[PDB]
Design a protein around this motif. Structure first.
Motif, short mmCIF file in Angstrom:
data_model
loop_
_atom_site.label_atom_id
_atom_site.label_comp_id
_atom_site.label_asym_id
_atom_site.label_seq_id
_atom_site.Cartn_x
_atom_site.Cartn_y
_atom_site.Cartn_z
N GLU A 38 3.23 -9.01 -1.78
CA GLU A 38 4.38 -8.12 -1.65
C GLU A 38 3.96 -6.71 -1.24
OE1 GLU A 38 3.82 -10.09 -4.18
OE2 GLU A 38 5.53 -11.44 -4.38
N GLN A 39 2.78 -6.27 -1.68
CA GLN A 39 2.29 -4.96 -1.27
C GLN A 39 2.04 -4.91 0.24
OE1 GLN A 39 -1.05 -3.79 -3.87
NE2 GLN A 39 -0.29 -5.32 -5.33
N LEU A 40 1.45 -5.97 0.79
CA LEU A 40 1.22 -6.02 2.23
C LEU A 40 2.53 -6.07 3.00
CD1 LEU A 40 -1.39 -7.95 4.24
CD2 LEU A 40 1.01 -8.52 4.65
N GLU A 41 3.48 -6.90 2.55
CA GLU A 41 4.76 -6.98 3.23
C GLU A 41 5.53 -5.67 3.15
OE1 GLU A 41 6.62 -10.31 1.35
OE2 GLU A 41 5.32 -11.79 2.33
N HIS A 68 -2.93 2.29 1.72
CA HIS A 68 -1.73 2.11 0.92
C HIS A 68 -1.97 1.30 -0.35
CE1 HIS A 68 0.03 3.48 4.70
NE2 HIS A 68 1.17 3.67 4.06
N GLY A 69 -3.23 1.08 -0.72
CA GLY A 69 -3.56 0.42 -1.96
C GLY A 69 -3.61 -1.09 -1.91
N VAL A 70 -3.59 -1.69 -0.73
CA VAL A 70 -3.65 -3.14 -0.58
C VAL A 70 -5.12 -3.55 -0.59
CG1 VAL A 70 -3.11 -5.11 0.87
CG2 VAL A 70 -1.48 -3.22 0.68
N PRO A 71 -5.54 -4.43 -1.51
CA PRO A 71 -6.94 -4.89 -1.49
C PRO A 71 -7.19 -5.80 -0.29
CG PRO A 71 -5.68 -6.07 -3.15
CD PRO A 71 -4.79 -4.97 -2.65
N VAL A 72 -8.24 -5.49 0.46
CA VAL A 72 -8.62 -6.24 1.65
C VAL A 72 -10.10 -6.58 1.55
CG1 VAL A 72 -8.71 -6.28 4.17
CG2 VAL A 72 -6.87 -5.05 3.01
N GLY A 107 -8.98 -10.77 4.50
CA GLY A 107 -8.14 -11.49 3.57
C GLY A 107 -7.55 -10.58 2.51
N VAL A 108 -6.35 -10.94 2.06
CA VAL A 108 -5.65 -10.21 1.01
C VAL A 108 -5.27 -11.19 -0.09
CG1 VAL A 108 -3.61 -8.84 0.44
CG2 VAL A 108 -4.82 -8.44 2.60
#
Ligand SMILES: O=C(O)c1ccnc2cc([C@@H](OCCCN3CCCCC3)c3ccccc3Cl)[nH]c12
Ligand SMILES: [Mn+2]
Length: 292
Positions: free
Chosen positions: A216-219, A252-256, A209-210
């Motif tokens: 927007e970071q994930l996209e 890329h800095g996306v929290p998961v 989950g994000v």
């Protein structure tokens, strides 16, 4: 090798907190919306019966080629699908299905997704409405007998058939019969809706989950690394093939956040929380989008 993301929040509500789902979800929101997904373990004595029409349950699952993106550059019953699912997993790992560590299936799943040397193909019973053979939960609609000790589950607010689904302006649950490596790629719900997911039985369902604040970071990471041939596709079509290793998003800095949803446990996804995952083995899940 794959590095597991941090664990998402797990809540064990008391019988008082378990009285109303929407009230409990609203209370856990300050934390759970910062992780996108959360897991909810009902009290120990809350055990709803499985109310699907097992005798007539038949379906044709979809074929899933794990490495179909990297490669660019049969009717079952519940029993017969379980026999195929257990045979596949025990043969793949050369050990009983319940002995395979969840971390190993997770590590092997993401290796196979990006592997061009090995083409692993599985099947997923993912297009099953609860109107076909009934919901996994007991319902008071007359089509099936309800025992007295089962009536509380037919009336429970945590019964996915009793979740509010009508949005204010000027649907029934769906079923998922999984096997090892069957998966669902990154997506958000229509109208950025909540979703609640219940694993009736079987081996765990692994989730990623994000939180919505990183949507927007994930996209953006998708726009950079997803295949160019699908770059100009709308989100509804692109999310049919939005397969991406969680470590790539984390780099890329996306929290998961991750979790292993076990039998009898709920998973709630918050508005605009991107999520994906795969099944550890033969299991049965029920899901519905709800409104607040
Ligand atoms: O499999 C699970 O347990 C599970 C748990 C949580 N969410 C989901 C969603 C799916 C599946 O799509 C059904 C509705 C998607 N919807 C979203 C956007 C508007 C249009 C379509 C799915 C998606 C991608 C790849 C494979 C599969 Cl199967 N499976 C899920
Ligand atoms: Mn979903």
């Amino acid at each position: 090798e794959f590095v597991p993301p941090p664990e998402c929040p797990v809540f064990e509500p008391s019988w008082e907190e378990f009285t109303d789902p929407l009230s409990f979800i609203g209370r856990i929101r300050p934390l759970a919306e910062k992780t996108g997904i959360c897991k909810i373990r009902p009290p120990k004595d809350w055990q709803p019966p499985f109310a699907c029409e097992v005798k007539s349950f038949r379906f044709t699952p979809r074929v899933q080629r794990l490495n179909e993106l990297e490669a660019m550059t049969r009717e079952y019953t519940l029993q017969s699908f379980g026999e195929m699912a257990d045979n596949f997993k025990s043969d793949y790992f050369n050990m009983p299905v319940h002995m395979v560590p969840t971390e190993l299936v997770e590590k092997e799943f993401w290796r196979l997704v990006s592997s061009i040397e090995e083409d692993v193909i599985v099947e997923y019973g993912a297009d099953i409405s609860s109107k076909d053979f009934g919901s996994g939960f007991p319902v008071k609609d007359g089509r099936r007998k309800i025992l007295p000790e089962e009536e509380e589950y037919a009336l429970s607010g945590w019964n996915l058939n009793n979740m509010p689904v009508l949005e204010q302006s000027v649907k029934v649950p769906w079923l998922y019969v999984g096997m090892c490596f069957s998966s669902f790629c990154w997506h958000i719900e229509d109208h950025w809706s909540y979703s609640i997911n219940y694993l009736h039985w079987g081996e765990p369902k692994t989730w990623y989950g994000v939180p919505s604040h990183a949507a927007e970071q994930l996209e953006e990471v998708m726009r950079e690394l997803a295949p160019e041939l699908f770059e100009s596709q709308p989100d509804l079509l692109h999310q049919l093939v939005t397969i991406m290793n969680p470590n790539v998003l984390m780099e890329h800095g996306v929290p998961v956040y991750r979790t292993n949803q076990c039998a009898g446990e709920f998973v709630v996804t918050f508005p605009r929380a991107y999520h994906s995952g795969f099944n550890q083995g033969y299991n049965f899940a029920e899901a519905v989008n709800f409104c607040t």
